[PDB]
Amino acid sequence: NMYLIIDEADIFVDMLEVWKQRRFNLRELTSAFNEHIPRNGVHVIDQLMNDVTSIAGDLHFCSTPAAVALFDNSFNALSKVGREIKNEAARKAFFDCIYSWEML
């Protein structure tokens, strides 16, 4: 029934190039697993949370070499935490989540 007028489609695409993103929010992942929480690993998540702010700065997306290197390193340093979740079902859910992130 509806028709679509995307006024200012130039900015639409330009920021679509941002919207082509899924924010793996470590605070959200920290908040998501609040019962199966290997709290010792939080430091790693906290250290990575610092690094993102250092590379990302004030940008929602930043193309310095650090960003992809930190992306791989963060998920490897999260794979370290992957062997810390105690509940096996939660561990596999976490493993599958990062695996989906890893393959994506």
């Binding site: 702010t53 250092s54 700065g57 004030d58």
Partner: protein, 117 residues
């Protein structure tokens, strides 16, 4: 020696097990006279006056150095969220703050250094 190879190589000491390292020392130097009052009885009244002017000047230097460091670390947060090549001017500013701190130190007569540190 310089240019003569030394036959001896003294390797590094590598711990065997995990852990086996941690923070030692610590503590804090203190004012003797709040630790033991008996030393008041050896010091002459003029030296008691000197020690109490030393306490008051050390404590006022402390509080004002402290608020200074507090704005300094809020500025360090600004630097942690500043841009590239704009932080070098804030760093000139920080070095100036530092100089100022060391001058505030200098112009404190004898006890330039915080005692209860």
């Amino acid at each position: 020696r310089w240019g003569l190879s030394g036959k001896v190589g003294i390797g590094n000491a590598i711990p065997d097990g995990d852990n086996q390292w941690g923070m030692f020392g610590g503590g804090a130097r203190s004012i003797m006279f709040q630790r033991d009052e008996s030393l008041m009885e050896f010091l002459e009244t003029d030296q008691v006056d000197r020690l109490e002017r030393l306490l008051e000047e050390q404590a006022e230097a402390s509080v004002d150095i402290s608020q200074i460091k507090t704005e300094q670390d809020a500025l360090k947060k600004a630097m942690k969220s500043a841009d590239k090549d704009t932080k070098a001017e804030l760093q000139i500013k920080v070095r100036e703050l530092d100089e100022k701190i060391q001058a505030r130190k200098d112009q404190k007569q004898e006890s330039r250094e915080s005692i209860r540190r």
